[PDB]
Design a protein around this ligand. Sequence first.
Ligand SMILES: CCCCCCCCCCCCCC
Ligand SMILES: CCCCCCCCCCCCCC
Ligand SMILES: CCCCCCCCCCCC
Ligand SMILES: CCCCCCCC
Lengths: 115, 56, 48, 62, 446, 100, 48, 55, 106, 341
Amino acid sequence: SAVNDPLELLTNKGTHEPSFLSPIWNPIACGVAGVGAAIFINWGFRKPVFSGIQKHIAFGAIGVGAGAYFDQKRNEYLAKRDAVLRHYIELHPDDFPVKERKTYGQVLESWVPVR
Amino acid sequence: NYEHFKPTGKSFRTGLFAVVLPIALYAWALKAERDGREEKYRTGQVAYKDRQFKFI
Amino acid sequence: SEYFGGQHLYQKLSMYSKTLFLMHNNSLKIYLLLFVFWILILLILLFL
Amino acid sequence: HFYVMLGVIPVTALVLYANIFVGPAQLAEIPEGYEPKHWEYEKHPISRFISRYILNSDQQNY
Amino acid sequence: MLKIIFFLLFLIPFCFINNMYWMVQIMMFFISFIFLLMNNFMNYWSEISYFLGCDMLSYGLILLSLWICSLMLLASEMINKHNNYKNLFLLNIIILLLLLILTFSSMSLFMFYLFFESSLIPTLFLILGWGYQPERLQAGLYLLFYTLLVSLPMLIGIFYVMNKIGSMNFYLMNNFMFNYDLLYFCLLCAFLVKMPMFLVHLWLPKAHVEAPVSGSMILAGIMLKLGGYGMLRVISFLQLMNLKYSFVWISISLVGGVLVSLVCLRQTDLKALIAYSSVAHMGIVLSGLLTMTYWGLCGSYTLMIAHGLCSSGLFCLANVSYERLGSRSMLINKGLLNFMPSMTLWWFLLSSANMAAPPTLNLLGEISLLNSIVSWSWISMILLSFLSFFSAAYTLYLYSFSQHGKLFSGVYSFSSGKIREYLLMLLHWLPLNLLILKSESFMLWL
Amino acid sequence: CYTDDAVCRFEADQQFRRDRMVDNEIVNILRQRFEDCTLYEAPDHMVKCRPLMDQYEKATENWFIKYGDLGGYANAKTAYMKQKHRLIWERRHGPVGSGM
Amino acid sequence: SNRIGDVALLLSIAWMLNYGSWNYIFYLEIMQNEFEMLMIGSLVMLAA
Amino acid sequence: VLGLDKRALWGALPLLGFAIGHFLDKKETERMTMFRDKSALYGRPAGSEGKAPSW
Amino acid sequence: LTTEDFANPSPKNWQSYGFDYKDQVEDRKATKSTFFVTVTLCLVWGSFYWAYLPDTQFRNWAQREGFLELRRRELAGVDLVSPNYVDPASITLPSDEDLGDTEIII
Amino acid sequence: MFNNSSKILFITIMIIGTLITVTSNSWLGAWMGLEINLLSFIPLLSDNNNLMSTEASLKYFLTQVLASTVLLFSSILLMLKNNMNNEINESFTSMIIMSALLLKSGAAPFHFWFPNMMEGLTWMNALMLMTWQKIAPLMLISYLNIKYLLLISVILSVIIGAIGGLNQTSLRKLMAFSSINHLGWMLSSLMISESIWLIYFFFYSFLSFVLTFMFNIFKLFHLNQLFSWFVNSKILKFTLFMNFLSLGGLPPFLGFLPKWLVIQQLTLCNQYFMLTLMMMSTLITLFFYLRICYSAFMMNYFENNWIMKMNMNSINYNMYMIMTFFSIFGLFLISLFYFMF
Ligand SMILES: CCCCCCCCCCCCCC
Ligand SMILES: CCCCCCCCCCCCCC
Ligand SMILES: CCCCCCCCCCCC
Ligand SMILES: CCCCCCCC
């Protein structure tokens, strides 16, 4: 690519594979947060930590469901954000033009020497 | 000990000629020597083969 | 260094908090009069 | 002294077994049709074992 | 560094199981063993997994922090016998070890800042909870506020660099360079206070004398190295402003370390003299950092690692004699050779390590940090010779007056040395004399 | 390499570091050649080791011309800017050390 | 009185790196007329 | 002579965390498979892709 | 106490090591395991692992390449250390009118 | 709320009046919503068995009635000159509208009623005063594009709310001065991003809503009542007192996140000097937070001997410990959030 086109910069070609934790990190972290919250409730009421597992199971299920739902809402929010940015770039092509890529063989920066 | 310390000209003179004044003359000497050596180095008065501290 | 640092900063902030506590020791009419003065200042400049 | 010797004696046995029974490697030219692997650039068999099995290659980190 | 972090994250629930203090120490030394077997790192960033990776600099700093925290559990046995909240203390040590590993494994500078400010909280908890004097409240407040007052505008600097560059990654930030004075002052003053310059040291002896040994060792061995590692990351893209403004910091950090060395000759507290000893040698480190020579950076990193080891080892000795004599001073602790003769060997082997000890890594760090200061200017020769002469004048007075002479003749009967204390002193000294055989892992981070 | 490209600045910086290392043991091997000349010609090292000292001094001069004054953080960009500024100075003001 | 010699040796080591190796015996007769090597010798003389 | 008594069976959980971190490191090595052989320093030219990958 | 007690000391009276002051069984496990995981593992087996570590930082390879580059450069007329980073024909050399007043640093 | 269903009715008309205020497309509808909110909040905060609660209600009444009449006056002047609901160019009547809104919000130098009245309250009405009653004047400040008056209010609020909270040892006036200091961070975010203000307000109300529950349940109206407060385990009191380090902005707690998003959005919008002025302000706020934190961080206290068991509500202490977990380990939810993109 000899030019840095913003349309080519913003368009998701599909070469970025998502990570292993990318679909699963938010539900397991929210489930761990719910289990720890129920543990913290049982600790403050001077119960055993794993006494009431109904609260543990309910808090974990609430955490996993909320994590999956808000991860989906996050994904559509980011998709709409990049769609807004792409549509604003195609709406005003004069303010975001195609710039020629300029190598270091045409650039004279000032090097900083220590002595 | 700090609660018995008051701003007095003897204490100000001790703090001036004990700490601040050697720092001032030492910084001035470092700046003057490095400015003279930097002017000599950037003007072009020394060569690459007759230069001190080549790290080699 | 403790005179330009933490202990004298604590003494200065304690003195400023003692002074600002005396600002809150009056009745409400003083502060409402201050607000009325500030509104009167902004209304005089509307003429100007 | 007990735990230093309890460390050193299996270390001495492993070093003697590597230096005597499996031996070091010999330097040779690279063949034209052969691309050497990332553990074949090192002389000692313990270094070859460590680079092949335990440590990652320089190419992977690069 | 996901395996180490998840190892400590599942080492967290051992605090809630009773009678498992030494088991946590055993598994943390196993973490140090595995991290010894993870060495394959070079210059750039290796073992990259979920914004975590290290170079040789960060490898040595994580290895030093892991060694100090495991020794810290070994050092703190008074928590175990008195049952003085050992579960909370173990959880504080493991969480602070996670925060120090995470601020050293950071590929971007903002994780370094975030976990660097997160690491101030368990240290403050150690100060406020496990000291012995009424001036604990004066100690942790000085530490917290002297760190925070200069570390809060550096966040504005970080977001100024991010907007200008767009990323916080340490290699992408190496390409750019900036000619702003206030950006330089924000990105430098937090590290200039966090590792003590002479004008801003104040918080260090207050935090060190009050702190428990498990709390003084994490201030001496590490967490001054955060303020050196921060400059090792930051000075790469601020070279021109550093050449504009180095001479004031070099002059201050070379006059201090002579004045600081003359301070220790006129002090009687054992823990305060090592507290000012941390200022003088990292005055050499701070002087060698702001000269951007290759030997300066390499010898600076070497003296950071080795000075952390010997200062934590010297603060180990100041609590062995404190718990036997009730209170530490020069006057009470005069001449402990006739009381503990076998402790005196480690006393000299670690007090000599504070100065130039011949086969240790302290000398190799010091012999190459003097090279950069001498090559920087010849004016600095006068105030370096006085600095090292007064350095070994004070640090030989420590061993000299504490380990020689007539006894106090007013002390009561105390316990002798134990297997734990000699093993604790051994693992501070023999790493100083054994890592010199592979000093290139502690010299070359570039 | 382009200005915004970072995948190729890594390769150029790594080969610059490796060439710096290669030239470092070039100078180190030449210094050991001079020292072995000094030990082997024990009473006559003022005659035999003068050309070896000449090659060592030329190698140190060329090493400082390529790598000198860059500092601890020497990228491939910094040495190229140094070489461009040095060639500009020898184009305009003559060789370094003559004056101007 | 020995630490003055130790720091004089440190400053001699700090000056000796202009030509690379601190093994002086291969450079003393070569550089007996060099100012940096006389300053190395002066620091070594002070240490001794 | 080791000193691990019957309370050392609790230590299987940090080794499980070691296995979890090693599996996540392997998954991140699998995630970074772009430029596996396309680098200019270790990459062979075209027509020789039939061999096994290096890592 | 008598001289028969001191001449035949009791097993039940034990001088405590530094780890646990409650049980004798807990000291004789903690000393052994702490000496195993520090002295044997970290300082002997770890030092053996470091002694046979590969060239993670390229130093032996750099020495070999130094001998090889001194072998080739002494054969030809190319000098032993190149003074220039690249060839000067690839240097663009912008003119003095293009530079104008620009800081040139040597 | 407590002891009556008519207080639930007053809360309902409170929510109705505030949501009438903030949704109004005219200043007159916003003004009548403020009248409804004032009508709702006079009877809560009034109790005839308390001699100072009626004086606090009188102080609130006089301050809000003076501020609502100035707000209607300058609204009528804005309609008189620039006949639409807003103004094209900023003038002095917009400054009078902003000043009358700042008297309702409690920002400096019109802050003086706020901690002088909070001594007369309970803790739940304090929480309703410094969270929900700051919805309606702060959301109406967003319609005015004035930089100097808002900047003066921000600087004065962060200077005074930090300095002023050092002297009081009573927790209600100290927390009121803390709410003045957190008001300046809200007003500093009000002229860069309304969403970032909403996030700082939501997390500030979350930390206020969890710190009220520790004081409402155990009735902690003084600083030494914290030192005499009995817990059955000192590690529990150590964990419960970490919310003050959260409200001080210390990472890795939850309250570092809204301050951090304000600092990030301020630096993107090229404000640096008042951000640095707010760095020195929040150190003093963290300093008078630490005097509360003296009561749990030393792990052992010379405590009163007669009290032996601590007592709490069921549902209130159950809801308290859900949010105390999220006020400590709330930075693990940084991946879940999607507002900040
Ligand atoms: C205590 C364990 C909580 C997590 C259980 C496993 C949850 C897995 C993620 C949620 C489902 C994702 C489907 C795509
Ligand atoms: C065929 C040659 C086999 C050689 C095996 C050498 C094994 C060395 C293992 C070194 C690491 C040990 C870690 C505990
Ligand atoms: C006291 C008994 C300890 C061992 C059994 C309980 C813990 C099992 C942990 C299993 C982890 C995989
Ligand atoms: C198969 C891997 C499971 C990992 C679970 C924990 C992730 C943080």
